Design an enzyme around this catalytic site. Structure first.
Site, PDB file in Angstrom:
ATOM      1  N   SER A 142      41.843  53.860  45.872  1.00  0.00           N
ATOM      2  CA  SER A 142      42.343  53.617  47.253  1.00  0.00           C
ATOM      3  C   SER A 142      43.853  53.627  47.349  1.00  0.00           C
ATOM      4  CB  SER A 142      41.682  52.374  47.831  1.00  0.00           C
ATOM      5  OG  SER A 142      41.692  52.367  49.269  1.00  0.00           O
ATOM      6  N   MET A 143      44.529  52.468  47.592  1.00  0.00           N
ATOM      7  CA  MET A 143      46.014  52.588  47.566  1.00  0.00           C
ATOM      8  C   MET A 143      46.511  53.241  46.283  1.00  0.00           C
ATOM      9  SD  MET A 143      47.871  49.371  49.421  1.00  0.00           S
ATOM     10  CE  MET A 143      49.491  50.076  49.070  1.00  0.00           C
ATOM     11  N   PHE A 195      44.255  47.784  47.650  1.00  0.00           N
ATOM     12  CA  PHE A 195      44.549  46.594  48.451  1.00  0.00           C
ATOM     13  C   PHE A 195      43.303  45.790  48.655  1.00  0.00           C
ATOM     14  CE2 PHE A 195      46.800  44.688  52.099  1.00  0.00           C
ATOM     15  CZ  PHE A 195      45.765  44.222  52.894  1.00  0.00           C
ATOM     16  N   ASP A 247      31.360  54.633  52.594  1.00  0.00           N
ATOM     17  CA  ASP A 247      32.648  53.969  52.718  1.00  0.00           C
ATOM     18  C   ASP A 247      33.027  53.773  54.180  1.00  0.00           C
ATOM     19  OD1 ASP A 247      35.359  53.313  52.698  1.00  0.00           O
ATOM     20  OD2 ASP A 247      35.693  54.338  50.785  1.00  0.00           O
ATOM     21  N   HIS A 297      33.179  51.264  50.127  1.00  0.00           N
ATOM     22  CA  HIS A 297      34.551  51.427  49.658  1.00  0.00           C
ATOM     23  C   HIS A 297      34.724  50.710  48.325  1.00  0.00           C
ATOM     24  CE1 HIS A 297      38.739  52.111  50.008  1.00  0.00           C
ATOM     25  NE2 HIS A 297      38.997  50.846  49.796  1.00  0.00           N
TER      26      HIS A 297
END
Lengths: 277, 277
Positions: free
Chosen positions: A98-99, A32, A228, A257
């Site tokens: 991530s997502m 995202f 992160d 991140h």
């Protein structure tokens, strides 16, 4: 190019995708609120090493359709199942960022690994971000994530500025590891995503993947930045390696991140060393 | 907020309601002599689970108008029909608590389930609380309920004290599962309801729902506490379970009538599991 994954009223829900190169298929699943183009530094490296690279945009992001339904990991994993069946891939590598690490875990859990040779989890969500009585290892109480959703709904365009400041650790990296122009490109991608998905996607971030993890039965890599700010390494990658001890594990020193861009060389060296095995 | 449901002399009859969250509509219908706010522990859980929660206050209770007319389940169900049509709720779940289980059954029976996905009956009145020759499973004959009407008409404010003592099993739960402050809040809600409705509502408790039950044609949940002193489980839920054997059936061991508060964890777990199907 597009793959149809469902219908929404009179329209079809189509996901934008690309398919490049020749070699073992490596499917990259973005985070995202970006798109498959956010993997450009890893796509270049994979193509240079003789892999086939497939990328797609999650529903509501990038150039995919923007439905107002389906923001949940069962639907996101069913969309990936449709992609993989349509392309009829075999011996594929699934790499999530991530997502995208949720699509990888939920897809393997629900659909199995007959088409899959390896999985990689970069800047992972797993195992379960909510800090609760049954999950004391969680990153934060649900109200913290509820506040992120409320900030997107208040003005997503302004929300993206502060979001990318912490996503890329801009106080440390602006002008060194990431230019103002590359951040502007990220903001543009974010604004191109659907309004509904922008505020609904964060409700999926804190999905509990603990029952999916025992079903990951292929070689795996877990990689995370120690800086992160978005997904703290102590409540995600370090707990995920205890839950998935067969995985290879890498911590990228000082990385934020948004390490696909800021620490592309460190991500690419670790990912290609893993895929070479 | 209010929905108008009718006219009484020069005044309109307005029901207080709230509408929060987003997702599948879940309509929560409270019991006597409380209001939509008595669902706060369930509302929080449903909102966190991604449902749209609609609550309203029965005529004569809570913040709704206090007419001296309409205290019967056909009117109560017609009031619910006006709420559902006014809001155009579709694919909705109806959840009743005690008196609210009458609206749910009478509505489905008279109006059908075109708008309704599932129904849940918590601490139910059903099937027919009056003990007669034709209905030996009833809890008590008419004279018992005439006595309650007369006690409310004699001093409703004092009546509420002993009523809540039995409602929450305070000899077992005061200071553990329900605080003195939460009990005081219930008394205040009761005192805020209309004088006429307070004494007219008990006559409706022994409405016969036996002809309505066979018309429930969507998935159903029946849940009750085994320590219910107000609506004994042997005259209600266990009989209801035999009249509607296809419904999911949950007995909450040792719980009193007022289990939305005292056993909210159990009620929320059962309700969310049922709604997730």
């Amino acid at each position: 190019p597009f793959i149809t994954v469902g219908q929404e009223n009179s329209t079809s829900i189509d996901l934008y995708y690309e398919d490049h190169g020749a070699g073992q298929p490596v499917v990259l699943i973005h985070g995202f609120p970006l798109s498959g183009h956010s993997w450009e530094r890893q796509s270049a490296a994979l193509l240079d090493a003789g892999y086939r690279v497939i990328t797609y945009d999650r529903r509501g992001f990038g150039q995919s359709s923007q439905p107002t339904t389906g923001y949940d990991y069962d639907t996101f994993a069913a969309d990936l199942n449709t992609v993989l069946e349509t392309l009829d891939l075999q011996d594929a590598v699934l790499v999530g960022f991530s997502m995208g690490t949720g699509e990888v875990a939920r897809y393997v859990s629900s659909y199995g690994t007959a088409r899959i040779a390896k999985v990689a989890f970069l800047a992972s969500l797993e195992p379960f971000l909510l800090k609760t009585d049954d999950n004391p290892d969680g990153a934060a109480p649900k109200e913290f994530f509820d506040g992120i959703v409320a900030a997107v709904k208040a003005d997503r365009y302004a929300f993206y500025t502060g979001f990318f400041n912490d996503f890329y650790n801009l106080d440390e990296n602006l002008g060194t590891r990431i230019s103002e122009e590359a951040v502007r490109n990220s903001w543009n991608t974010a604004a191109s995503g659907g309004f509904f998905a922008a505020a609904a996607a964060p409700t999926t971030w804190y999905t509990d993947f603990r029952a999916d993890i025992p079903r990951i039965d292929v070689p795996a890599l877990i990689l995370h930045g120690t800086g992160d700010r978005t997904l703290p390494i102590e409540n995600t990658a370090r707990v995920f390696h205890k839950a998935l001890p067969s995985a290879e594990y890498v911590e990228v020193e000082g990385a934020p991140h948004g390490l696909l861009w800021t620490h592309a060389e460190e991500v690419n060296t670790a990912l290609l060393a893993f895929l070479a095995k």
